[PDB]
């Protein structure tokens, strides 16, 4: 039951169905007590039943509606679990990761398979907490909350902070994703090399694993928080370690278009 706008309020459709049941259940009790003409008692017990269906699952038998405004099936508990896009359903479509990011990609010719160019500006938000603490370890800030306000505005960052982030990211690595993740190589790990601007510098050789060309395809980026997640990420998920495809014993780090033409 929430406060929207103007004082508009917002409540899960479940509550209109619950009241249904409660009112009828109650009206039933009072109808028995008052005295009981058969027809009226059943009449209600009917409605009652129907109601009990409503919350559980709407539509198996008739479809309940909120008053004239939306001829819509009030989401039943079942619709919750199943639905057009419901509970286990979008459970599996996806959830949103806390330490994520996403920008345009651009070819990073000098970059080595090992690494990837990541916008410092992006790194900052991404590795914010890792930086905050690192700030306190140095003279840049007294405490966390301090370190926080110290970065709440763009013009207030001392160049000492970048040296802290560049120090925080030392040997950590992140994951990069492409639009349709079709195979496992659709997500690869690299060592970030912080760079200016907005674009994300990607290696050319792995442009074949991710079906990615540079006319605007954007890649997302995730952060391995546990020392374990990091362990796996850079040991068995990093790029330079997975050279041969799982489909064929054929390499996937093959000199793509430009390299061949040259050689």
């Amino acid at each position: 039951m929430v406060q929207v706008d103007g004082g508009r309020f917002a409540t899960s459709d479940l509550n209109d169905l619950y009241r249904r049941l409660i009112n009828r259940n109650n009206r039933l009790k009072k109808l028995l007590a008052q005295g009981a003409p058969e027809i009226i008692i059943r009449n209600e017990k009917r409605m009652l039943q129907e109601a009990v269906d409503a919350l559980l699952d709407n539509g198996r038998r008739g479809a309940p509606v909120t008053n004239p405004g939306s001829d819509r099936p009030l989401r039943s508990l079942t619709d919750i679990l199943s639905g057009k896009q419901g509970r286990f359903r979008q459970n599996l479509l996806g959830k949103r990761v806390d330490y994520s990011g996403r920008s345009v990609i651009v070819v990073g010719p000098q970059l080595k398979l090992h690494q990837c160019g990541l916008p410092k500006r992006m790194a900052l938000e991404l590795f914010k907490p890792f930086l905050l603490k690192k700030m306190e370890e140095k003279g840049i800030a007294p405490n966390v909350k301090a370190a926080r306000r110290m970065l709440e505005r763009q013009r207030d960052i001392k160049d000492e902070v970048w040296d802290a982030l560049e120090e925080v990211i030392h040997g950590k690595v992140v994951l990069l994703n492409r639009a349709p993740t079709l195979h496992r190589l659709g997500i690869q790990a690299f060592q970030p090399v912080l760079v200016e601007g907005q674009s994300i510098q990607l290696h050319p050789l792995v442009c074949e694993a991710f079906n990615a060309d540079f006319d605007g395809d954007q890649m997302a980026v995730h952060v391995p928080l546990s020392s374990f997640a990091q362990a796996e990420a850079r040991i068995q998920m990093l790029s330079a370690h997975n050279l041969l495809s799982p489909a064929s014993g054929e390499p996937l780090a093959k000199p793509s278009r430009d390299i061949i033409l040259g050689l």
Partner: peptide, 12 residues
């Protein structure tokens, strides 16, 4: 089947 008709018929 559908609930109005049945009761209507019922007491009518």
């Amino acid at each position: 089947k559908i609930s109005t008709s049945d009761p209507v018929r019922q007491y009518l």
